[PDB]
Amino acid sequence: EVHHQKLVFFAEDVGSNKGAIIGLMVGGVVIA
Amino acid sequence: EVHHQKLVFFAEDVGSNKGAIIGLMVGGVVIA
Amino acid sequence: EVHHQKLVFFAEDVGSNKGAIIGLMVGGVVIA
Amino acid sequence: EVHHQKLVFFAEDVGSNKGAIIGLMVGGVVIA
Amino acid sequence: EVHHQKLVFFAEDVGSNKGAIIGLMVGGVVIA
Amino acid sequence: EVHHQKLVFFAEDVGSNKGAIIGLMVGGVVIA
Amino acid sequence: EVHHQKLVFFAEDVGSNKGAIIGLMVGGVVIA
Amino acid sequence: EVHHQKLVFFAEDVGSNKGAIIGLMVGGVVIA
Amino acid sequence: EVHHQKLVFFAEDVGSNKGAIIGLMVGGVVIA
Amino acid sequence: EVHHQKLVFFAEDVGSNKGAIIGLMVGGVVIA
Amino acid sequence: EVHHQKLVFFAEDVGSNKGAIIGLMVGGVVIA
Amino acid sequence: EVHHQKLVFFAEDVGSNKGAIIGLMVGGVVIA
Amino acid sequence: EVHHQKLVFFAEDVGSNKGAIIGLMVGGVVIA
Amino acid sequence: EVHHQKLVFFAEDVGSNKGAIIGLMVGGVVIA
Amino acid sequence: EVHHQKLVFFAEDVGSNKGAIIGLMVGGVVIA
Amino acid sequence: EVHHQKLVFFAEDVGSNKGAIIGLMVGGVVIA
Amino acid sequence: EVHHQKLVFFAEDVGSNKGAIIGLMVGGVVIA
Amino acid sequence: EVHHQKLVFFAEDVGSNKGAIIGLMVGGVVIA
């Protein structure tokens, strides 16, 4: 029982979130 | 089941989420 | 041969979800 | 076995959130 | 409880967050 | 101790956070 | 005769935080 | 002058924090 | 002068902080 | 609008190619 | 190269293409 | 402002290549 | 043309290349 | 021609290269 | 705004190279 | 103001190189 | 009033280079 | 302090190098 690459983003309870972008390789992003 | 690679994004209870884009390779991402 | 890769997005008791997408290879994305 | 990559972002309870972007490599990001 | 590369960001109880960008190799970033 | 790399940023009870960026190789950051 | 790379920034109770940038190699940085 | 590296900045209860930058190599920094 | 690379800065309770930059190589730094 | 995302692994005039695998999200890869 | 996503695995005049696999998502891969 | 993302593992006029693996988010690779 | 983020691993006229592993986030790589 | 984020591991006229690994957030790497 | 993130591990006219490891945030690396 | 970030490891006219590791933040590096 | 931050490990005309490592912060380095 | 930032480990015309380690905050460095 062992993990290697643990990629968790916002993996939990949340109330209000605006503008969520997840990407190892990205570009040109505008969060209004 | 989670083994070695775990790619999760906002995997849980949420109240109000606006704009959720997940991608390893992407471009030009705008959120209102 | 066993696979140890896992990929997923938001998935649970959500209240107000507006604007969601998942893509390993995709460009040009706009959310309202 | 000396490979252990832990990537946890916003992995917890939160109230309000505005502007969330994650990516090992990116280019050009604006937060409102 | 041993980990080689540990990457923890905003991983805890938070009230209100505004402008959060995580990226080992980022460029041209602005937070309002 | 151990020959490992641990990175932590904002991992505790937080109230109001404005302007947060993490990048070992960042260039041009405007935290308003 | 030991060794370890520890990097902890802001890991406790915080109230009003304005301007947070972490990175070994950072160029052109400005906070308000 | 050789041993483990313990990099710790601001690891306690704090009220207000204005202009916080952490990084060995930093060029051109305007902390307003 | 010490031997171990213990870089500890502000590791206790603090009220209000105005301009805080931690790093070995620093150039063109202005605090308000 | 659509951004510009290129993903090239190899080019013409290869010659002797022995072992070439490409995968944005893949696990377990052994090449002779 | 263009205003879109272009994933190039191989090109002409390859000569000897031994061991070629392309998959956006897949686990367990063995090639001679 | 203009932003683009270009990823290239190799180029033309290679000659002889043995053992090539590319993956944005993978785990467990061995080359002979 | 102009480009912001460009991940170049190798170039033309490489000649002989043995053992090439390219990946943003991984864990567990071995080359003969 | 504004190469903001340019990550080059190798250039042209390589000749002979044995054992090459590139990764922003990787771990557990071994080369013969 | 002014900035530029340029990183190069090797240049033209290489010739002979063995054991190459490039990574901003990595750990546990052994080269023969 | 004008600020930039450059990071060069090796230059042209190399010839022969054995054992090269580059990383702003690495833990546990052993070369033969 | 600062120009910029630039770091160079080795220049051109290196010839025969054996055992080389670079990193703003490293823990546990050994060269044969 | 308010001045150009140019860190150079070694210059051109190296010739024969063996065990070259560079880094602001190093730890457990041993050269054979």
Curated annotation (Swiss-Prot), chains A, B, C, D, E, F, G, H, I, J, K, L, M, N, O, P, Q, R:
Binding site for Cu(2+) 2: H3, H4
Residue(s) at site: Implicated in free radical propagation: G23
Record site: Susceptible to oxidation: M25
Residues of the site described as Cleavage: K6, L7, F9, F10, V30, I31
Consequence of substituting H3R: Only 23% zinc-induced amyloid-beta protein 28 aggregation
Ligand binding (Zn(2+) 2): H3, H4
Region described as Interaction with PSEN1: spans on this chain: 14-32
Protein name per Swiss-Prot or TrEMBL: P3(42)
Source species of the chain: Homo sapiens
